[PDB]
Design a protein around this ligand. Structure first.
Ligand SMILES: Nc1ncnc2c1ncn2[C@@H]1O[C@H](COP(=O)(O)OP(=O)(O)OP(O)(O)=S)[C@@H](O)[C@H]1O
Ligand SMILES: Nc1ncnc2c1ncn2[C@@H]1O[C@H](COP(=O)(O)OP(=O)(O)OP(O)(O)=S)[C@@H](O)[C@H]1O
Ligand SMILES: Nc1ncnc2c1ncn2[C@@H]1O[C@H](COP(=O)(O)OP(=O)(O)OP(O)(O)=S)[C@@H](O)[C@H]1O
Lengths: 157, 621, 85
């Protein structure tokens, strides 16, 4: 696989909060909590692009963590998520994995998170168009993604 | 097998015959050998200015090994060309570059000295870190890896000598530049490699000229390199000429195929002032279509009855470069030089003694007679005011360049205090304006054919004279940056106004008491100008009226002048103390004032023609 | 772009394009550098050379050479690591 710094930081934060939690293996909900509560998070505007409320992305996946008996290793659903993510990175030829790539791999890898995003309302045809309206082809870091809106103000508006 | 990834094979390249013949430089190669074959610390470093041949020496040594002229301690050894750039290619992780370099070093030591690593541009060995190019320091001092390096003279003391722990493991070899006699031989050996690439032939009388000529014109670069470019360019140009038509038959056709479109899209202008321009452009077109068809005829006179480069293509190249004309006076320029005090006489009138001295040091330099290391001419002309001594230095800069503002004028009246010298020479390192060089200096270093003019020189402080002291008589002065600038092709002109009326020795003794003998001695003839006689003003009158008329043609507005007025103005040119300046004020008081009054008061419009006539006292339009 | 007709016409400057071509087709060290004060036409000459190549006024060695305009700004874009540049 091919990591960017944001996915590395999400994996490191989920592993630190998992080793604090004392689990035999790290669940995908650890990575989901790491990515939705990430600084400069590109997951909450991603679900804003497909019309998902943010008042349930820290409750219904939190119930997927406080039911486990409190060094973990990666779940096989997570490895399938990274596998389909690396496969889905071969069409748009972005050389590294991304946070939206982690999101579409988690939506395709484990059907448990896909059940939650389908119950809140999201289709894989729509969330594959979630980024292209907020992206606008990719280096390692993230200084693209509507650079005019973050380095300028509008005088006419 | 790790030496296959990060390096090519110099000895193998030399085996297949892919390197240029190396000639001479026996001492350098023998010292490289007897340093490369000692017990410890056996790694030389070639050092010297850029271009004098320092990779040529290593390639010569490699060909020498392949042949077998080397001693027993070096027979049958391969030279590998290490490539530090392709090692740091992908090494983003925290130890991969060190791993690569360690594998390479271990593999070099794993052989028994059958490899001689050769690093080019080794000043780049200091970085590679982010503790790198530093793990080599043990193996260096023991003689495991035989290192042959070559960096220029001044990046050595900038990157290496800063690290006296590492520059201890190197033995310096100085590579001085060759002379003309040796460069001739090097070219005699290299000729047959260009003779093939360009399908042409090169003449030995041209190989001598490309080395004698490129030693007095191009001083910013060093030897052979600045002498091989001329040969290569001449051959490439000759091949171009061979394929297509020759030159001076190509440009005449290119501009003709343009004047056509110009006049074609111009003839559709529903305008009246544009009719005088179209009827003037339509003449140069028919004039060019004449000499074009004459060239196509004169070319068949030769093509029925220029196939290898000679000492002429070289001169043409070193003339297109550097701008300096060093040709052979191709029968069009000589006819122009023969009547020069006739083309200067259309702007300066009188002063025959001075026009036939300025004009006299141009011929005797274009014919190849003047001293090749001294300015083309350095003379000062002085006399009374308004006589024409700043005009001659502009009629001259216009005969040679066809533009009066392509010369270098500095008004020496602002150099009243001695510290104003730094304005023309730069400021020493570590001061405010240093990344700007001089001001006179940087003006000539870019086009070394201009004509410098020091106007009103006796008004300055007698130290700027001492700065000029070496410009004359040697044509050299170096600025703050330490760059020597050559003046051996300029024409130095110094005006003045000393004496002011003294016959000949009230002025010749006033120059002697303001300047020093060591400064008067560098000069050529000290020209004396003379007052204006009443006869030689009736002609300046015509010049002035022609000037004004040309200035008026912006409105298609002429004027007729009667001989009575023309000899009235010249008789009111007065006071042989103010020269010929009063006349230019008289003209505008008489004609220009009332013309301008009539011009914006209606009653005179464009296209008209106003006749002047001498009223009993004044001029009436 | 020269083929697609997007570069302004280039008029005059024959000596310069001649020298550029003959330097651009020699054996070793063929690297012409146009130098001179700002504004006098130095990109215009290269565009003229490109249109000339598309037309066919060049010597034999410069037939179908496909001029390329490098860009070192987009090359150092993201290379914060050790060997990415
Ligand atoms: N002794 C020589 N015999 C034959 N050709 C030579 C000789 N010395 C130099 N040359 C040629 O002149 C040119 C000199 O180029 P190089 O010596 O390779 O450059 P350099 O002298 O290393 O200068 P730097 O420091 O590398 S930029 C090359 O075309 C060489 O083939
Ligand atoms: N012999 C001359 N032929 C033609 N024009 C002249 C002549 N002498 C003076 N002039 C005119 O005078 C003006 C230039 O005079 P200058 O020679 O430049 O003054 P000058 O000789 O430098 O004297 P000073 O000491 O510098 S004020 C121009 O308008 C010229 O047309
Ligand atoms: N010979 C020419 N033929 C046609 N257009 C020309 C010519 N010379 C200049 N121009 C035009 O005049 C302008 C000159 O711009 P450029 O020459 O491209 O700028 P420059 O000369 O490269 O100076 P810099 O250093 O690049 S800002 C452009 O609008 C050109 O189209």
């Amino acid at each position: 696989f091919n990591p960017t710094t944001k996915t590395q930081a999400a994996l490191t934060a989920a592993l630190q909060a998992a080793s604090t939690a004392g689990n035999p293996e790290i669940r995908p909900a650890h990575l989901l909590m790491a990515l939705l509560t990430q600084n400069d998070g590109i997951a909450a505007p991603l679900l804003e692009a497909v019309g998902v409320e943010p008042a349930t992305v820290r409750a219904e996946t939190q119930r997927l963590l406080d039911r486990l008996p409190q060094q973990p290793q990666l779940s096989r659903e997570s490895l399938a998520a990274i596998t389909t993510a690396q496969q889905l990175a071969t069409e748009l030829d972005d050389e590294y994995v991304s946070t939206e790539h982690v999101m579409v791999g988690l939506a395709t890898g484990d059907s448990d998170v896909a059940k939650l995003l389908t119950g809140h309302g999201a289709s894989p045809q729509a969330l594959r168009e979630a980024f292209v309206k907020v992206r606008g082809t990719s280096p390692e870091p993230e200084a693209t993604y509507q650079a005019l809106q973050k380095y300028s103000t509008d005088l006419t508006a | 097998q790790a030496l296959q990834k990060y390096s090519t094979d110099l000895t193998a390249r030399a085996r297949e015959g892919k390197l240029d013949p190396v000639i001479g430089r026996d001492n350098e190669i023998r010292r490289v050998v007897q340093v490369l074959s000692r017990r410890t610390k056996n790694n030389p470093v070639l050092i010297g200015e850029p271009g004098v041949g320092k990779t040529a020496i290593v390639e010569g040594l490699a060909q020498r090994i392949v042949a077998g002229d080397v001693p027993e301690s070096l027979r049958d050894k391969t030279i590998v060309a290490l490539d530090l750039g392709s090692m740091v290619a992908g090494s983003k992780y925290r130890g991969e570059f060190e791993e690569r370099l360690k594998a390479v070093l271990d593999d070099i030591k794993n052989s028994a000295g059958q490899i001689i690593t050769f690093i080019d541009e080794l000043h780049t060995i200091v970085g590679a870190g982010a503790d790198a190019g530093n793990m080599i320091k043990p193996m260096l001092a023991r003689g495991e890896l035989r290192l042959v390096g070559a960096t220029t003279l001044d990046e050595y003391r900038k990157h290496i000598e800063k690290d006296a722990a590492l520059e201890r493991r190197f033995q310096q070899v100085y590579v001085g530049e060759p002379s003309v006699e040796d460069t001739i031989g090097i070219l005699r050996g290299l000729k047959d490699r260009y003779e093939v690439h360009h399908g042409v032939r090169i003449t030995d009388s041209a190989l001598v000229a490309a080395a004698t000529l490129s030693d007095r014109y191009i001083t910013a670069r060093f030897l052979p390199d600045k002498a091989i470019d001329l040969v290569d360019e001449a051959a490439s140009r000759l091949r171009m000429e061979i394929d297509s038509r020759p030159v001076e038959i190509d440009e005449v056709e290119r501009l003709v195929r343009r004047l056509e479109i110009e006049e074609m899209a111009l003839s559709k202008e529903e305008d009246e002032a544009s009719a005088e321009r179209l009827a003037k452009l339509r003449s140069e077109l028919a004039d060019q279509k004449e000499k074009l068809a004459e060239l196509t005829t004169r070319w068949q006179n030769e093509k029925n009855a220029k196939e290898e480069v000679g000492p002429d293509d070289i001169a043409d190249v070193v003339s297109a470069w550097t701008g300096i004309p060093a040709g052979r006076l191709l029968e069009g320029e000589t006819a122009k030089l023969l009547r020069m005090e006739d083309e200067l006489g259309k702007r300066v009138i009188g002063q025959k003694a001075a026009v036939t001295a300025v004009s006299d040091a141009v011929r005797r330099s274009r014919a190849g007679v003047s001293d090749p290391n001294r300015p083309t001419g350095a003379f000062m002309f002085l006399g009374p005011t308004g006589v024409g001594k700043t005009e001659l230095a502009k009629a001259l800069a216009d005969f040679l360049f066809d533009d009066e503002r392509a010369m270098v004028r500095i008004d020496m009246s602002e150099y009243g205090e001695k510290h104003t010298v730094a304005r023309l020479i730069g400021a020493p390192p570590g001061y405010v304006g240093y990344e700007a060089g001089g001001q006179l200096t940087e003006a000539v270093r870019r086009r070394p054919y201009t004509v410098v003019l020091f106007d009103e020189i006796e008004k300055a402080h007698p130290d700027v004279f001492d700065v000029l002291l070496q410009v004359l008589d040697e044509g050299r002065l170096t600025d703050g940056h330490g760059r020597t600038v050559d003046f051996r092709n300029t024409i130095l002109i110094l005006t003045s106004n000393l004496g002011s009326g003294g016959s000949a020795e009230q002025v010749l003794a006033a120059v002697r008491a303001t300047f020093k003998p060591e400064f008067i001695n560098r000069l050529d003839d000290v020209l004396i100008f003379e007052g204006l006689n009443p006869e030689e003003l009736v002609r300046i009158v015509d010049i002035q009226l022609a000037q004004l008329g040309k200035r008026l043609a912006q409105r298609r507005l002429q004027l007729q002048v009667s001989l009575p007025a023309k000899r009235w103005l010249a008789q009111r040119g007065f006071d042989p103390v103010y020269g010929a300046r009063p006349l230019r004020r008289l003209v505008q008081q008489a004609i220009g004032d009332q013309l301008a009054k009539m011009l914006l008061a209606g009653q005179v419009h464009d296209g008209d023609t106003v006749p002047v006539n001498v009223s009993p006292d004044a001029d009436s339009l």
